[PDB]
Each structure stands twice: as structure tokens, then as C-alpha cells.
């Protein structure tokens, strides 16, 4: 905020824009208020009643989410695992010593305070096997509006056909709209998140197949973090080294935003990956909506470094495409030229001995490592304009790309450097 005046008449002007809060909620700021997350559920009706409730309800268009929650409880209540080591997260010691932990030890059971429904018989305990797998799979199916990508219902149908050969989807085609509402019931999401969190620890459980459909709950609305992992993998550099190659102020603020020190983002098994479905946070701090310049920068740099995932990563709105693209060009060019090949194994204890008697002064050549302090200086020697070898390198990287979707950084990079 600095004073601005109109030079024709010395009139003072106050340039101001509309403001949008859109604050950010971290997971660990939820647990300092409540030391436990509740699961609202109805424990009145019996299991074999709920089986026909949700089977006959599934066959038709009418079904109560309260009945699929109350059915998923008792349908998954007697599933267990033995902890090899202790399990604690955000001050919640879920598992103590060698005692076995169930799938609902993670949350606390509360009572929901009713749907009349309709019942069915002849439904044995052989449907308790896959009906949870089904209802869990429809959460992953019912989150995508693409007509052919929603055909993951064929892979849920297949994964249950593996459990019982004569399994065919008990839902009408109009059902493409039936389970789309299930993702709005907080307790259903608190169920799928507990299922995925449970089966992440107990990996080779006989019912680990249930994780299909709930795997989309892990790190949901946390794309930018996964782009940081993808960049730290594609570049081959450490997290602290990649962190230095951030040359844009927005990516700096966002990188400071993701790396707050008390959110267990590094723990293997934690409540953090499920901060959205558990209700630990209503606005994730690790999304590509609150970290747009980081998503664009890291994804584009990866793409220039021969990435495959980035070919379909989406281009955010309202960011500095020019500065971000130049930064990604210098970074990807630095990593591209500096392969840093070094001998690793020797036979007769003979290693490569570099020759230091090269004194013809081979200057005006790019640096030898991947240090930012040297590539910024070389780039200054290039007048902060990308050299034709950099632009040609990027053209080499983005050309021969085919089948590119619109609004993706693959078509963006191709449309930017391939001409």
C-alpha cells in the first residue's frame, strides 16, 4: 500500500480490488479443540435387515444413506488387525501395545438421531462379503462426471466378480446419479476414510481389496504436495535442493504454506491424508487451488524433464504464466544439461580422475552442477533472457507430444515452445 497520484491534476487515487478470504484450515488445528472425531450412525436396526434394506434399495432408485452407513458399520465392525508397532496420530493413541485394532477404533461412535425403507429376505451372509466393497467403490465411481472414466464401475463390478462369480451391479443405469449424493454425507466419508486409513496400515489383509474405491480418499484435495513429490522424483534432487530452485514469490509463499511444521505430512500412517473426508479441514492447504503457481511451475518443469503425468495436468487460472514458465525453463534446462554422470563402481580400484590442466579458459559455458547460485549468475550473463539453446531444448521436449487435452499444461507447453 503506497500512495498513487494522477499526474495531470495531482489527484490522489486508491486502486483497490474486491477481497476474498478463502482461509486455510490445517489438520492439527482441529485436534487442539477436539481430541477425537465422531461418526454419527444409527444402531437400531439389525444387520440382516439392513442387508435387504440396501440391496432392495440399491435395485431401485431409492436408498437411504443412513441405511448404507448403519449397514456398513455392522458389515465392517468385526474386521481387525494386529499392530506390530504402536500407532498414534495428533495426540490420539489409537493402538496400545500388541492389542488388535478394528476399523472403527480410529473414530468414536455416536448415535444418529428413522428412514422407513423397505426390507428383503433370502439375502444371506454371502452378500455381507461384497456389499461393503460395492458401496465403497461407488464413492470413487461417483466423483467423476466423465462418461468413460466413470466406467470404473466395471472394475468394481470386476473386483466383486472376483469375490462371487455371479455378481452383477444391483443398480439401474440412472444409478449414475444415485451414489453421487453419498459423497455429501459426512459420516459416509468418515467411513471411507477410516477404511482406507485402516487398510493402509494392515496392507495384506484378506479384505484389503476393500481399499478399492476408498484409495481416492488418501490425499484428496492435496495435489500440489504430490506435484512436489513428483518434482523431487523427476529432478532426482533432494527436497531441500528443489526448494532452493523456487524463483517466484508466489511459489515461495505457497511452499511456505504447505510446509507448516506440525501437520504430520511426513508420517507414514497418519490422519493427515484424510483431512477432508474426516472433516479435519474444510479448505485443504495442499490443494492446487490454494497452491496454483506451485502446481503449474512444478508440473511444467517435470513435463520439460520428460514427465508423463504432467502431459494431462491442468493449467490453473489467474497466475503469472510468463515468470513461472521462465523459471521452469531455467530449472528444467539446468537439470537437463547437468546430467552429473559420475562413476559408481570400480574394478581394479581405478576411478575417473578429472584433469585440471585445462586452462584455455572455456568460459561463457553453463555451470557444471545444479546450484541455483551459479545458474542465476549464468542467466544474468544471458541478460535474463532464455538463450536459443534453452528454447530449442524446450521445443525438443514438447514436440512429438500427441493426444493433448485442452486446458492442460501439456498443450500449454506444446503451444508455447513448439514453433
Amino acid at each position: 500500500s503506497v500512495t498513487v497520484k494522477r499526474i495531470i491534476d495531482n489527484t490522489v487515487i486508491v486502486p483497490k480490488l474486491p477481497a476474498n478470504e478463502d482461509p486455510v484450515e490445517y489438520p492439527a488445528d482441529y485436534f487442539r479443540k477436539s481430541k477425537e472425531i465422531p461418526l454419527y450412525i444409527n444402531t437400531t436396526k439389525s444387520l440382516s435387515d439392513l442387508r435387504g434394506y440396501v440391496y432392495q434399495g440399491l435395485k431401485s432408485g431409492n436408498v437411504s444413506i443412513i441405511h448404507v452407513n448403519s449397514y456398513l458399520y455392522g458389515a465392517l465392525k468385526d474386521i481387525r488387525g494386529k499392530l506390530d508397532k504402536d500407532w498414534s496420530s495428533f495426540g490420539i493413541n489409537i493402538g496400545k501395545a500388541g492389542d488388535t485394532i478394528g476399523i472403527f477404533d480410529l473414530v468414536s461412535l455416536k448415535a444418529l438421531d428413522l428412514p422407513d425403507g423397505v426390507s428383503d429376505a433370502s439375502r444371506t451372509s454371502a452378500d455381507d462379503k461384497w456389499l461393503p466393497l460395492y458401496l465403497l467403490g461407488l464413492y470413487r465411481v461417483g466423483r467423476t462426471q466423465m462418461p468413460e472414466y466413470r466406467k470404473k464401475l466395471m472394475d468394481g463390478l470386476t473386483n466383486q466378480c472376483k469375490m462371487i462369480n455371479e455378481q452383477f451391479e444391483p443398480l439401474v443405469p440412472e444409478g449414475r446419479d444415485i451414489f453421487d449424493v453419498w459423497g455429501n454425507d459426512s459420516n459416509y466419508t468418515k467411513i471411507v476414510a477410516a477404511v482406507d486409513m485402516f487398510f493402509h496400515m494392515f496392507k495384506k489383509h484378506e479384505c484389503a481389496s476393500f481399499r478399492y474405491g476408498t484409495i481416492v480418499s488418501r490425499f484428496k484435495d492435496c495435489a500440489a504436495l504430490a506435484t512436489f513429490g513428483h518434482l523431487c522424483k523427476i529432478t532426482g534432487m533432494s527436497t531441500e535442493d528443489v526448494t532452493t530452485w523456487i524463483l517466484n514469490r508466489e511459489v515461495a509463499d505457497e511452499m511456505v504454506q504447505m510446509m507448516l511444521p506440525g501437520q504430520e505430512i511426513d508420517k507414514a500412517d497418519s490422519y493427515m491424508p484424510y483431512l477432508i473426508d474426516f472433516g479435519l479441514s474444510s479448505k485443504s492447504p495442499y490443494s492446487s487451488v490454494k497452491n496454483p503457481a506451485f502446481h503449474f511451475w512444478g508440473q511444467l518443469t517435470a513435463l520439460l524433464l520428460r514427465s508423463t503425468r504432467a502431459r494431462n495436468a491442468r493449467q490453473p487460472d489467474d497466475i503469472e504464466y510468463t515468470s513461472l514458465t521462465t523459471a521452469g525453463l531455467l530449472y528444467a534446462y539446468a537439470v537437463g544439461s547437468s546430467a552429473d554422470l559420475a562413476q559408481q563402481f570400480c574394478v581394479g580400484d581405478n576411478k575417473y580422475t578429472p584433469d585440471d590442466s585445462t586452462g584455455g579458459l572455456t568460459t561463457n559455458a553453463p555451470p557444471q552442477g545444479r546450484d541455483v547460485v551459479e545458474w542465476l549468475g549464468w542467466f544474468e550473463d544471458q541478460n535474463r533472457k532464455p538463450t536459443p539453446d534453452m528454447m530449442q531444448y524446450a521445443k525438443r521436449a514438447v514436440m512429438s507430444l500427441q493426444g493433448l487435452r485442452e486446458k492442460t499444461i501439456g498443450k500449454y507447453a506444446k503451444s508455447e515452445f513448439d514453433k
Partner: nanobody
Amino acid sequence: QVQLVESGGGLVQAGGSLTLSCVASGRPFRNYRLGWFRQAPGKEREFVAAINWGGVITNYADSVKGRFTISRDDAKNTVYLQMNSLKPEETAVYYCAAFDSTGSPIVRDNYEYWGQGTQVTV
């Protein structure tokens, strides 16, 4: 597994109040229904009161509505039950029960765990 211990019984004057408690041991960090039952001399075990896990949904037998009150503190893993305006028809052994779920049944076949029971004479 879960163990339940009933405490708070005894004799009381006809028309007097009393409050039983039930302490749970073992695995209190899991869904489990809480209900009170009783059995009179030569009478089959009957339902008295029940409470859901969260501690919002409750229900009482007709013979005790108004008088009795049920409550639970799952932090201390217990469940109190006030018994005001007692009557000699109220004389029976009172049992604390648990069935693992998210509700409270009105029958005795819905529970899974039972205490040893306390005598209450009026």
C-alpha cells in the same frame, strides 16, 4: 472383550432415590451399546433402560418412565442411572449390559456383554 462391573446397589426406603453405576474394563475405545436390565424373584430378565454410544439416544421401560434416568461418561467409561421414587416392585437384581454397535436395543438378545449384577431391595 469387555468387562462390566455394577456398583451402587443396596437397600433403600420405600419412596427413596438411588443411583447405580457400571464401570467398563478392557476395550472402551469402540462402539458399544449400554443398557440396564433387571430380574425379580421368579421373574424373567426384563429391560429397564438403554443409551446409545454418543449419549443422545435413550429409552426406558414403561414401568420406570419419569423416575429413572440414564447417562454415560465414556471418558471415564461408565454409565450412571438415577432411580428416584423407588417401589418394592422395583426390587430385583440389576444388570449392566453392552452390545457393540451404535444404538440401544430394547431386548436382552441384542446385548453381548453382561455384568454380574447388583441386588436392589426396596
